Amino acid sequence: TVFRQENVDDYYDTGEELGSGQFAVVKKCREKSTGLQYAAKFIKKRRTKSSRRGVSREDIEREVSILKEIQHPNVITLHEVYENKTDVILILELVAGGELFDFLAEKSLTEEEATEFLKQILNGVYYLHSLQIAHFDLKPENIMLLDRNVPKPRIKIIDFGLAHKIDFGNEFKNIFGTPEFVAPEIVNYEPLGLEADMWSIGVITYILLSGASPFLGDTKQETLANVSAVNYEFEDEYFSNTSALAKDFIRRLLVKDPKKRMTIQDSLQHPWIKP
Numbered sequence: 001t002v003f004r005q006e007n008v009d010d011y012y013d014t015g016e017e018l019g020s021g022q023f024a025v026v027k028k029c030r031e032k033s034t035g036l037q038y039a040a041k042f043i044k045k046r047r048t049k050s051s052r053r054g055v056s057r058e059d060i061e062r063e064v065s066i067l068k069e070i071q072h073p074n075v076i077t078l079h080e081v082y083e084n085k086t087d088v089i090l091i092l093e094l095v096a097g098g099e100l101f102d103f104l105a106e107k108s109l110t111e112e113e114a115t116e117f118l119k120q121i122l123n124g125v126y127y128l129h130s131l132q133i134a135h136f137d138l139k140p141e142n143i144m145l146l147d148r149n150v151p152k153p154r155i156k157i158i159d160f161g162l163a164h165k166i167d168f169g170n171e172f173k174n175i176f177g178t179p180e181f182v183a184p185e186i187v188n189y190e191p192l193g194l195e196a197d198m199w200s201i202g203v204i205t206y207i208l209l210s211g212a213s214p215f216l217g218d219t220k221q222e223t224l225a226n227v228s229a230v231n232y233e234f235e236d237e238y239f240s241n242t243s244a245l246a247k248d249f250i251r252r253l254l255v256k257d258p259k260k261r262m263t264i265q266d267s268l269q270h271p272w273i274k275p
């Protein structure tokens with residue numbers, strides 16, 4: 001699938017940088033014809049068949065295809081896609097309140113503040129999983145606020161760079177996500193499905209309530225070993241005033257066997273969440 005090959009600079013002006021990663025950088029931008037503001041994600045293309053630098057076109061096309069399907073208040077929307085010899089440039093909805101991760105460093109949240117964020121995450125993931133889309137990269141870095149100066153900020157899931165359609169119940173590919181947030185099946189290179197996202201939600205919930213990462217070791221290999229062994233516990237120093245029902249929600253997500261883990265529908269009916 002080919003994308004728009006006119007120079008993006010003829011149609012947009014760029015501004016402040018919003019984030020940069022391994023092979024991509026995101027810049028605030030403004031469409032000249034409308035004055036509307038977006039986030040331009042420049043993804044570096046691979047320049048040879050067998051290179052390790054840049055992103056393969058198959059991977060770029062999958063991210064674009066997923067983004068084109070989604071329209072939900074808690075997920076980023078795609079506006080346009082351009083390309084040139086060096087980059088694919090996705091013009092994405094602008095979410096400018098910063099990461100949940102940076103918001104988290106400023107506060108530990110109350111259970112109400114946690115559940116207000118968490119319910120929005122669950123609603124976005126419910127939409128995705130209903131479409132058989134696994135995100136495969138859920139973590140505070142990929143949750144951005146619309147306005148960080150309201151008591152209950154609205155959030156959007158970003159970065160569909162690892163997302164896959166799961167039309168056969170599972171996909172057998174390597175997912176090099178962030179060790180602190182990946183499920184045991186990712187660590188063990190097993191077939192992957194929607195369940196991996198539910199584990200990540202359990203990790204996110206633990207962090208929201210405590211400010212601490214449940215599996216984090218001193219090295220990436222320690223973290224991955226802890227994940228595979230389900231080596232976590234609720235430290236009383238951090239959880240002493242957290243309700244047992246909140247701990248129960250987490251416990252039913254941080255389950256090694258994907259088949260025994262709560263699904264997204266289970267998580268919405270769980271007594272901690274269900275109104």
Ligand SMILES: COc1cc(O)cc(/C=C/c2ccc(O)cc2)c1
Pocket residue numbers: 018019020021022024025026038039041076092093094095096141144158159
């Ligand atoms: C590319 O690498 C990164 C790393 C990172 O920590 C954050 C971002 C921000 C993405 C983004 C997308 C759409 C928006 O509207 C606003 C931000 C990008």
